[PDB]
């Protein structure tokens, strides 16, 4: 979903956290009518839209040959990869990487950053956790 008059100018990720094995990061953002957000998401979260991308944009991806065999101009950033077992020194670097990489997704050009797709990370979610904040 996108809402006119309230879209993404910065995202960071803040810091991360463990509930019963499992780690979650604190993802916050900046609408454009001065609105933020404290979000609650996991890697999946951000490796499942880094799919998505990947996948929408081929050329900006660097996943496209033109016909001399050149790979297309990568643009889009990368995400920390994913890893068989999970520990806290893996995730304090993820929350490190995550942050750069959420900034570096909302400061995309607009055919990208403006997307429904890139938007749908930062949505409020009915998780007991996501809240909107009003300027």
Not at 20 to 29: G, Q, S
Not at 39 to 59: C, N, S, W
Not at 75 to 93: A, D, E
């Amino acid at each position: 979903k996108l809402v006119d008059g309230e879209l993404l100018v910065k995202a960071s990720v803040e810091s991360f956290g463990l509930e019963d094995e499992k780690y979650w990061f604190l993802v916050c953002c900046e609408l454009s009518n001065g609105k933020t957000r404290q979000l609650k998401r996991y890697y999946q979260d951000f490796y499942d839209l880094q799919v998505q991308l990947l996948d929408a944009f081929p050329a900006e991806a660097g996943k496209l040959r033109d016909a001399g065999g050149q790979w297309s101009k990568r643009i889009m950033p990368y995400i920390p990869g994913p890893v068989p077992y999970v520990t806290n020194s893996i995730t304090k670097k993820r929350k490190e990487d995550l942050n750069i990489y959420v900034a570096d997704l909302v400061n995309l050009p607009d055919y990208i950053s403006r997307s429904e797709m890139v938007h749908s990370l930062f949505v409020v979610l009915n998780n007991g956790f996501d809240r909107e904040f009003e300027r």
